[PDB]
Design a protein around this ligand. Structure first.
Ligand SMILES: [Mg+2]
Ligand SMILES: [Mg+2]
Ligand SMILES: [Mg+2]
Ligand SMILES: [Mg+2]
Ligand SMILES: [Mg+2]
Ligand SMILES: [Mg+2]
Ligand SMILES: [Mg+2]
Ligand SMILES: [Mg+2]
Ligand SMILES: [Mg+2]
Ligand SMILES: [Mg+2]
Ligand SMILES: [Mg+2]
Ligand SMILES: [Mg+2]
Ligand SMILES: [Mg+2]
Ligand SMILES: [Mg+2]
Ligand SMILES: [Mg+2]
Ligand SMILES: [Mg+2]
Ligand SMILES: [Mg+2]
Ligand SMILES: [Mg+2]
Ligand SMILES: [Mg+2]
Ligand SMILES: [Mg+2]
Ligand SMILES: [Mg+2]
Ligand SMILES: [Mg+2]
Ligand SMILES: [Mg+2]
Ligand SMILES: [Mg+2]
Ligand SMILES: [Mg+2]
Ligand SMILES: [Mg+2]
Ligand SMILES: [Mg+2]
Ligand SMILES: [Mg+2]
Ligand SMILES: [Mg+2]
Ligand SMILES: [Mg+2]
Ligand SMILES: [Mg+2]
Ligand SMILES: [Mg+2]
Ligand SMILES: [Mg+2]
Ligand SMILES: [Mg+2]
Ligand SMILES: [Mg+2]
Ligand SMILES: [Mg+2]
Ligand SMILES: [Mg+2]
Ligand SMILES: [Mg+2]
Ligand SMILES: [Mg+2]
Ligand SMILES: [Mg+2]
Ligand SMILES: [Mg+2]
Ligand SMILES: [Mg+2]
Ligand SMILES: [Mg+2]
Ligand SMILES: [Mg+2]
Ligand SMILES: [Mg+2]
Ligand SMILES: [Mg+2]
Ligand SMILES: [Mg+2]
Ligand SMILES: [Mg+2]
Ligand SMILES: [Mg+2]
Ligand SMILES: [Mg+2]
Ligand SMILES: [Mg+2]
Ligand SMILES: [Mg+2]
Ligand SMILES: [Mg+2]
Ligand SMILES: [Mg+2]
Ligand SMILES: [Mg+2]
Ligand SMILES: [Mg+2]
Lengths: 129, 122
RNA sequence: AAUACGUUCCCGGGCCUUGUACACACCGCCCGUCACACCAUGGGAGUGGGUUGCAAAAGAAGUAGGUAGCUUAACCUUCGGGAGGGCGCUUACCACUUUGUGAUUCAUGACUGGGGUGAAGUCGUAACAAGGUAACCGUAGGGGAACCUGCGGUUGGAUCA
RNA sequence: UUAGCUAGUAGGUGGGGUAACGGCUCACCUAGGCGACGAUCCCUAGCUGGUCUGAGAGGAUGACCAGCCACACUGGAACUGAGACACGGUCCAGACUCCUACGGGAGGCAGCAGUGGGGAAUAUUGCACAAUGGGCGCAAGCCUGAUGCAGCCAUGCCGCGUGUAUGAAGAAGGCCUUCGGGUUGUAAAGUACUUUCAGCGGGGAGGAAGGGAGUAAAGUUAAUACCUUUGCUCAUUGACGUUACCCGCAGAAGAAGCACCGGCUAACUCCGUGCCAGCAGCCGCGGUAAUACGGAGGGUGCAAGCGUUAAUCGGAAUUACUGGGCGUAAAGCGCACGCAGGCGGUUUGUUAAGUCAGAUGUGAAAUCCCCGGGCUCAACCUGGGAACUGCAUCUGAUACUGGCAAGCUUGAGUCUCGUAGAGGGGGGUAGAAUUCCAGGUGUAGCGGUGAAAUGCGUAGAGAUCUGGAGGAAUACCGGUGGCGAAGGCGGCCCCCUGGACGAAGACUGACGCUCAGGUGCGAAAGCGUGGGGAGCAAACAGGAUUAGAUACCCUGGUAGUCCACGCCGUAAACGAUGUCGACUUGGAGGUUGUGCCCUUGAGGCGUGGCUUCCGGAGCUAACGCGUUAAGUCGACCGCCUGGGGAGUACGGCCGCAAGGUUAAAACUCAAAUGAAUUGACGGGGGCCCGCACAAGCGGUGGAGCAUGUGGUUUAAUUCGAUGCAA
RNA sequence: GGGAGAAGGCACGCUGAUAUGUAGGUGAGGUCCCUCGCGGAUGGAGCUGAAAUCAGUCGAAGAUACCAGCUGGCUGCAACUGUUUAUUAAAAACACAGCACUGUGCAAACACGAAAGUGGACGUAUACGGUGUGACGCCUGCCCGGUGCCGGAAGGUUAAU
């Protein structure tokens, strides 16, 4: 049974990057759009566009730099079997700063740098490197 | 495997018993010799080791191994026993320490005299 | 001189593939009763203790209640005593101790079952090759021993139409 | 492998009691309370700041000190006292010890010392209230085995010394040697220069602030009396204390040992033995060349310390939350359903419980860390800061999770129509075939094995034909074909029924996945009852091979295999791969639907369900998996932590029994393992060669003769060769 | 199901309050009623009347007389309840349900009867008779040399006639 749409999205994008897919279409959601916005604001994906009235679908387009995939590892940290919540001063640091850790906070779904600048924590979602 | 299983069943340890039970976590124990004799090692090497079945003070009776050459100890002799077993002898788990109350040291010893209780030569 | 149809076969050798629990490399490895020594264990008619449960008996001192007696410094008195107090007795709680029957644990116990390590021991070769009956799994029976047989399943089996 | 416990027990009314609330207690009434979020019971254990180890998370632990509790020979009790059910207070019972005139009494060092036993081990029956405090006293003043200090122990940490600069005749001796050499080695001897520490003799702080006696001033009253306070002057005070420290004396004196040297790990050569003596944490050494045993020489490490032992942490990612695996090494319940539980598609609004931000209190002191200071440095002490990762409250943030109310269909379930199927249960029917019964024809064999015999035969066997009796399964179809959760299911027909898929259509609206306990199904073998029994076949009888053969082989043969109802719940219950969701290149098929094309052939183009083979990326130790992943994830359950002992015993449950289930401990071992590689072997296969066989020829073994070998005899029959290769 | 009344324990007299006699049973007179008398809905005047708490009291003793289980453990036999030698043996002796074998197709076997006839049985192989063992759990292992029983009449002997 589908019990983690975010994990499904991460699996789909990782498989698309592995198999050299131009774009990966999938059912979308508000949290999926929020995560795709963060992924596009960091250059990890080309772009995305929601298509559909009753059943919206995200159509994320992958980015390939010199053949090799731009995103190296996308790992779901907080899974729906073990919730992980970290304070402002306890946020992780992927690849000592070269990677990002998406965090959903009170102000929205921002990144590590944005959360640290704003001065508030949140609960992590996944590491992108 | 999973946290949901581990909260129900905590990860138990793998505690193993000590190899020196008769000492009862004690560096030394005083005993009285009961059966001093000689035994033979197992298959890989043949020799004639010197062993002694000694009754410890607490009540345990064990088999030690006399180190070096020359031991005046006999039945009804007070000896001191420390840990450490002999690999090539089955059953022994302890060593009689020389220089004890009655265990005399090895004669004409020049090297490692402290391990056999030998006075420093003049 | 004779004979050589052909590799069907004995012997020795050369190449490929297959299986191997062998690598001083099959004159390999290796299994279990049986005897002897030692060690640690279960059963064991019973034996001696520790702890403790249940149902009771038990009433030293000490607390609270009761007063057929014994007496009385503070208060009152109408001057006789009164109120109150103490002693004694009794009732209620309780300790030591005692009786009956259980539970747990420790040591011991004739004898007995299984297990482990052993030194050129006795008996046979079940598994590892198609191990020469192909083994293994569950089960029932049988036998000194490894094991054998029947039933159901697997190839974690070698050759070939 | 401790599952039910609790009847003052849960609550209520009233009374009593405590300083205070309260079944704390009493009388009555209600039958409740705890418990798989571990009740009850057993063993062990003082708790915390802290300490060790660990980068961290964690593990171990409660030495000193500090905060709390309990205890004072054992047990019970009460009184005084604000404060006790009281270490040096009281009463009683029990043991111990002691005095006695025998009537009767005295005591509790788990205080400081110290004594006797235990142990491997734990200190002197030392000085002082001079200071910091306590108790009493207005004060002076007294007590203080707390405290301040002295003594012993290298028990731990820190510092210093045991001389330094010269010093090649490379002195002498020792070590080995290739006898030329090098090693000890600037090491030593000798010269020069210092005296830290130990000793002697002098000087000499600080821990001392306080107190008493007078005097000037202030507060007081009637008072200059008496008191308190503020300054002043002389008395004064130290157990440590021959104090710390400084200075002069002289002399290099009085001051270094232990462990190791084959690899792990830094260090090699001889001598003595010869699997004996002996070493060892592992690998292992010694059988005459031991760098491994003992000694010597030399070298390495540490140092007033050096090694062994006992415990803890690390390495051990070897209980893995950080940080593992389950196809083959250990690890998927045999399968399915499902309670509690775990998780959960998508949108809005609301709440803000988790989560996120800020503030407050607290998180003792002590300890760690950072910046400074004092001890001549350090150990040690100390000031500030940080930290104490936690908790409670308040004020906000609303993305996520959670609660609430509305929606949606993509998840899921249902209708309407067809399709295939050894899906299951029950009842009938038809042949092949085997075995017996009866009859006919028919004569000397039948059966069996590598070969034989047991066995059936002249009482007519086997064979043939006819009729009859009874049991099981249904040759070809028949396939890496189908169905079913698994086990499993194969003639045909009927009756009832479960499940799966597809064409198009609408709603139900998260109703969804997994599952500890629990229930159900569950190959064969096995047991009970009542039947059946043709063939096959455990046990068993006979024959046979073999040294033996309680087996393989042959001839018979009981349970069983069969039916109905019952019992166990075991398998290599295997795809050794637990259920579901989606994502991630292809080829060749198999089965079964469905849409459209000129369906001239099993013509083509798409789309579904199941399944087989090959294989790319990816994964794996490799074999191998590879869209039906063993590729990357998500939700859940179960299991694994070295091989034996052992899935064994005990214990609880189930079972008529066999047995099943839950499941250890002591002891031993240095391995036990799986995928693959190179050899070797196979009573495995394929191919090939050689006088190796097959077709010859001649000889050897038969009887003397010439030789060598073995044994015999002797003083020697000298020694060596001892399969083919003597 | 049992052992089990396991074993072992506390109260039992009398008086008073509860209640000058409770609960419970029986249960009249007063009021509607009828499909009207031997009737129903309320009604408790009564007599009867346990069982316990609280307090007191007397004796050494309150199931105070008569009546009225001794208990537990280890074992052999028999399953048990019964029956058996009237009149020395009551038991381990017989029976027993259960189990096995055998014969019995009805005009059945068998037994009493020279026979009729009857019982079996006015039953019909799940019935009857006989023989063995004797509830129930694990089983009944090998042997037909001999004597009985059954199946066969190939061969030998064989009465009466
Ligand atoms: Mg060649
Ligand atoms: Mg025993
Ligand atoms: Mg009493
Ligand atoms: Mg009394
Ligand atoms: Mg074999
Ligand atoms: Mg054989
Ligand atoms: Mg085999
Ligand atoms: Mg057999
Ligand atoms: Mg199977
Ligand atoms: Mg009250
Ligand atoms: Mg670590
Ligand atoms: Mg403590
Ligand atoms: Mg005292
Ligand atoms: Mg003392
Ligand atoms: Mg001692
Ligand atoms: Mg003082
Ligand atoms: Mg005094
Ligand atoms: Mg020299
Ligand atoms: Mg001073
Ligand atoms: Mg070494
Ligand atoms: Mg660890
Ligand atoms: Mg692992
Ligand atoms: Mg395995
Ligand atoms: Mg294996
Ligand atoms: Mg399975
Ligand atoms: Mg099972
Ligand atoms: Mg909140
Ligand atoms: Mg906060
Ligand atoms: Mg300093
Ligand atoms: Mg602190
Ligand atoms: Mg919400
Ligand atoms: Mg159907
Ligand atoms: Mg289950
Ligand atoms: Mg069966
Ligand atoms: Mg047969
Ligand atoms: Mg046979
Ligand atoms: Mg049967
Ligand atoms: Mg199993
Ligand atoms: Mg399995
Ligand atoms: Mg399920
Ligand atoms: Mg299928
Ligand atoms: Mg493949
Ligand atoms: Mg078992
Ligand atoms: Mg052969
Ligand atoms: Mg009444
Ligand atoms: Mg007897
Ligand atoms: Mg009887
Ligand atoms: Mg009997
Ligand atoms: Mg009787
Ligand atoms: Mg009699
Ligand atoms: Mg008749
Ligand atoms: Mg009998
Ligand atoms: Mg019987
Ligand atoms: Mg018999
Ligand atoms: Mg016969
Ligand atoms: Mg006859």
């Amino acid at each position: 049974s589908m019990q983690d749409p975010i994990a499904d999205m991460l699996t789909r994008i990782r498989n698309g990057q592995a198999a050299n897919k131009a774009a990966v279409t999938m059912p979308s959601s508000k949290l999926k759009v929020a995560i795709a916005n963060v992924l596009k604001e960091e250059g990890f994906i080309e772009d995305f566009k929601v298509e559909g009235d009753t059943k919206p679908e995200l159509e994320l387009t992958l980015k390939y730099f010199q053949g090799k995939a731009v995103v190296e590892s996308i790992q779901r940290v907080s899974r729906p079997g073990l919730r992980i919540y970290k304070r402002k001063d306890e946020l992780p640091k992927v690849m000592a700063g070269l990677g990002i850790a998406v965090v959903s906070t009170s102000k929205g779904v921002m990144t590590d740098r944005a959360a640290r600048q704003a001065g508030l924590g949140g609960e992590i979602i996944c590491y992108v490197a | 495997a999973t946290v949901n299983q581990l909260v129900r069943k905590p990860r138990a340890r793998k505690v193993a018993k000590s190899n020196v039970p008769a000492l009862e976590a004690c560096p030394q124990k005083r005993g009285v010799c009961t059966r001093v004799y000689t035994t033979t090692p197992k298959k890989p090497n043949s020799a004639l080791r010197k062993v002694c079945r000694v009754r410890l003070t607490n009540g345990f009776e064990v088999t030690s191994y006399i180190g070096g050459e020359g031991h005046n100890l006999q039945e009804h002799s007070v000896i001191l026993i420390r840990g450490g077993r002999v690999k090539d002898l089955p059953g022994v788990r302890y060593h009689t320490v020389r220089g004890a109350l009655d265990c005399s040291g090895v004669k004409d010893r020049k090297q490692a005299r402290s391990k056999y209780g030998v006075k420093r030569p003049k």
